[PDB]
Design a protein around this ligand. Sequence first.
Ligand code: HEM
Length: 214
Amino acid sequence: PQDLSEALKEATKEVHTQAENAEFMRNFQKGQVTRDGFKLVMASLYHIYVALEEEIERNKESPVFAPVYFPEELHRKAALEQDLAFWYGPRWQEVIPYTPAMQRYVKRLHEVGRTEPELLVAHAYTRYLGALSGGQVLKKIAQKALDLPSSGEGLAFFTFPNIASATKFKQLYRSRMNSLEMTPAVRQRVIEEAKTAFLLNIQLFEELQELLTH
Ligand code: HEM
């Protein structure tokens, strides 16, 4: 399509369905998620966002990313830190898992941010616009399946406090993405990087499912 945001949505429809079909995601949707499984997911997210946000900060002023730099509205690291302290306890940093599949994703995020900056938008798009599109349904199924106490912690990651309206913000984020100037060659690389992001998530889901079924 014409708009980058429109191109991305179209090009990733296939892999997105693949992600929905992943065994781990299927069970999560079927309300079949265990606390051990959810903990692993949260640990994964922490590593992923730490890496992504480290690279976003590195390229914040670059013309290849600046247009989509929204630190206050989107940053998730602090929320995940809060959540992990609840899920793994006060010494969470020394006990949370960092698996090979998580490492593969983190490695690509750093490669992109350090040597292929123009593709970082593909990862920001996949993570942030994705969390803003179906994060409401995930949070719902989560709290209803984990039956956690009323301790007021554990799911901060699912709430973006600095965004008053998700619909309006997504419109703004899409507009900014479409404002980015890139050659047809780069545009193709960004589209392909978005598919790569989904694949990295899918391989992660597969690994997590394996770790939980021994
Ligand atoms: C449990 C599986 C999942 C479900 C049920 C789900 C559901 C949805 C829904 C309903 C939309 C469409 C929103 C709309 O346009 O009205 C959407 C969009 C999106 N999802 Fe997912 N999703 C899932 C997993 C993922 C994963 C694993 C990622 C990537 C890490 C992801 C990334 C995205 C992105 C980037 C969009 C934005 C599409 C656009 O540009 O409009 N989703 N998702």
